Design a binder for this molecule. Structure first.
Ligand SMILES: *[C@@H]1O[C@H](CO)[C@@H](O[C@@H]2O[C@H](CO)[C@@H](O[C@@H]3O[C@H](CO[C@H]4O[C@H](CO[C@H]5O[C@H](CO)[C@@H](O)[C@H](O)[C@@H]5O)[C@@H](O)[C@H](O[C@H]5O[C@H](CO)[C@@H](O)[C@H](O)[C@@H]5O)[C@@H]4O)[C@@H](O)[C@H](O[C@H]4O[C@H](CO)[C@@H](O)[C@H](O)[C@@H]4O)[C@@H]3O)[C@H](O)[C@H]2NC(C)=O)[C@H](O)[C@H]1NC(C)=O
Ligand SMILES: *[C@@H]1O[C@H](CO)[C@@H](O[C@@H]2O[C@H](CO)[C@@H](O[C@@H]3O[C@H](CO[C@H]4O[C@H](CO)[C@@H](O)[C@H](O)[C@@H]4O)[C@@H](O)[C@H](O[C@H]4O[C@H](CO)[C@@H](O)[C@H](O)[C@@H]4O[C@H]4O[C@H](CO)[C@@H](O)[C@H](O)[C@@H]4O)[C@@H]3O)[C@H](O)[C@H]2NC(C)=O)[C@H](O)[C@H]1NC(C)=O
Ligand SMILES: *[C@@H]1O[C@H](CO)[C@@H](O[C@@H]2O[C@H](CO)[C@@H](O[C@@H]3O[C@H](CO[C@H]4O[C@H](CO)[C@@H](O)[C@H](O)[C@@H]4O)[C@@H](O)[C@H](O[C@H]4O[C@H](CO)[C@@H](O)[C@H](O)[C@@H]4O)[C@@H]3O)[C@H](O)[C@H]2NC(C)=O)[C@H](O)[C@H]1NC(C)=O
Lengths: 139, 42, 110, 42, 42
């Protein structure tokens, strides 16, 4: 299982922080995802930062106001929100999953080396999910 | 009219001065000089 | 972009329901992998996974859940349902970044 | 019984005539030509 | 005080014995032997 920070209430305008912790260090090879769940509006994908540390994809719709960090030493996921508007009043879930790092077009060299490779990675699944943190913004 | 298909642009990838970074280099070639395998050629 | 049908469901317990997630792109990388998975959210609970790559269920989910499909047409045929399977269902496509959810299918016991 | 384990069916990757692609190629190697690092040999 | 930045500790990803896996390898270079583009040098 996973642990998330407790429910939070924030006055709009300032920032909020959410922490997702794994028990000890048993989930390190798996990649990290953040999701949002506006009630009655389905679920949205906040973004992900992978597990090797080579990706930081965050959806552009939330790129400006949302940051996702990972502390290796404590093995802790950090989610920072800045705008904190009425639309952010919802439940944020931390998920641990796995991807498929396929190798697409790659330029081998004459001698047989690997000059470069786009090797774009594909999302496979999100096995482990946090208990969910409710963030309430009230004016 | 006689150049309908007698020249090809044939843009393709290469490695720059650094063997890690990429570079999309475009060129020109004659029809008699490439073979189909848009449509890829070699 | 992604959608699925029907928007809401109501099936008598003990029967089999089928929901179809319609994509808008290939959803196939080479020829076999179908980077589309199903996620079920129980009321007041974190969503749970049922099947990844639209083919194989994970460890800890029984035989009831079963998804299958190809290209853009994928269906999950949940058979022998009970009171513990009522909730909302979503489909994740990982084929193209950014990866998105669906609009959710709320299943109810009829 | 004599040639048990003295022939290895090894499949691997090779750069093709082009370079943007690679091919899976199988071959037979005598045990005296390969060393362990199915199993990965070199 | 006469070696302020003269020696650069540069690491790269030269291939290992077999031409399929990369290995992180460090070395030292003289500042007259590198050009900027920690930072990136070639
Ligand atoms: C120099 O190198 C670059 C690499 O950077 C290379 O770029 C490729 O260019 C080709 C042609 O422009 C692209 O092919 C197009 O792909 C469109 C969708 O791509 C998705 O799928 C990619 C993987 O699928 C390929 O491989 C599988 C398995 O072999 C095969 O089944 C598929 O058919 C396809 O060939 C995937 O890599 C790609 O990922 C991109 O996007 C993600 C998300 O943003 C990003 O994270 C990645 O980094 C990458 O940018 C993407 O997920 C496809 O729609 C398109 O289809 C054409 O034809 C149909 C039918 O005619 C038309 O309807 C359509 O409009 C298109 O015209 C086409 O197949 C390929 O994706 C590029 N690769 C990458 C990594 O970007 C250059 O070609 C090289 N230069 C050369 C060779 O000269
Ligand atoms: C010749 O060249 C080809 C190039 O295509 C190469 O084949 C590809 O090799 C790569 C390298 O392993 C493969 O990438 C892995 O793919 C698996 C999924 O494989 C299944 O599904 C495919 C279809 O998609 C099937 O064809 C295949 O048979 C399998 O059924 C991924 O799951 C792997 O992901 C793991 O590694 C990633 C990094 O590489 C991680 O980011 C990721 O999170 C996964 O982590 C794994 O390891 C963790 C520890 O490191 C562990 O904790 C996790 O739990 C997890 O297990 C990986 O991306 C690719 O599938 C091959 N096929 C194709 C079509 O690309 C040949 O191998 C090569 N021949 C040689 C070298 O001899
Ligand atoms: C040899 O090969 C190895 C692995 O095979 C390489 O090691 C990795 O190299 C990649 C570069 O391709 C590194 O990825 C980059 O890491 C940066 C580290 O940033 C730290 O600080 C920021 C805050 O500023 C934190 O957010 C972050 O988590 C890190 O703690 C990132 O900043 C980079 O992010 C940028 O690029 C990504 C996409 O790549 C974008 O999404 C981001 O927005 C941002 O623009 C990037 O992720 C990776 O860290 C290396 N890992 C290790 C273990 O070394 C070697 O680089 C390679 N060496 C050579 C010479 O080829």
């Amino acid at each position: 299982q996973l642990v998330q920070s407790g429910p939070e209430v924030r006055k709009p305008g300032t920032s909020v922080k959410v922490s997702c912790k794994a028990p000890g260090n048993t989930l390190k090879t798996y990649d990290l995802h953040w999701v949002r769940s506006v009630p009655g509006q389905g679920l949205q994908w906040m973004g992900w930062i992978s597990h090797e540390g080579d990706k930081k994809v965050i959806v552009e719709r939330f790129k400006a106001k949302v940051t996702i960090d990972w502390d290796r030493s404590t093995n802790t996921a950090y989610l920072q929100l800045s705008g904190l508007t009425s639309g952010d009043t919802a439940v944020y879930y931390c998920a641990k999953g796995s991807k498929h790092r396929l190798r697409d077009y790659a330029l081998y060299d004459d001698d047989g080396a690997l000059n470069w490779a786009v090797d774009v990675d594909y999302l496979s699944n999100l096995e482990f999910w946090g208990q969910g943190t409710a963030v309430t913004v009230s004016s | 009219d006689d150049m309908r298909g007698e020249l090809k642009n044939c843009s393709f990838n290469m490695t720059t001065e650094l063997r890690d970074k990429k570079q999309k280099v475009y060129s020109l070639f004659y029809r008699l000089d490439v073979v189909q395998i848009n449509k890829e050629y070699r | 972009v992604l959608t699925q049908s029907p928007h809401s469901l109501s099936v008598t317990p003990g029967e089999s329901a089928s929901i179809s997630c319609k994509s808008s792109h290939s959803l196939i990388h080479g020829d076999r992998n179908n980077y589309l998975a199903w996620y079920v959210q129980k009321p007041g609970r974190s969503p749970q996974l049922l099947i990844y790559l639209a083919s194989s269920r994970a460890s800890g989910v029984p035989d009831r859940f079963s998804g299958s499909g190809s290209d853009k047409d994928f269906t999950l045929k949940i058979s022998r349902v009970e009171t513990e399977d009522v909730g909302t269902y979503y489909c994740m496509q990982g084929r193209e970044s950014p990866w998105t959810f669906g609009q959710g299918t709320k299943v109810d016991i009829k």
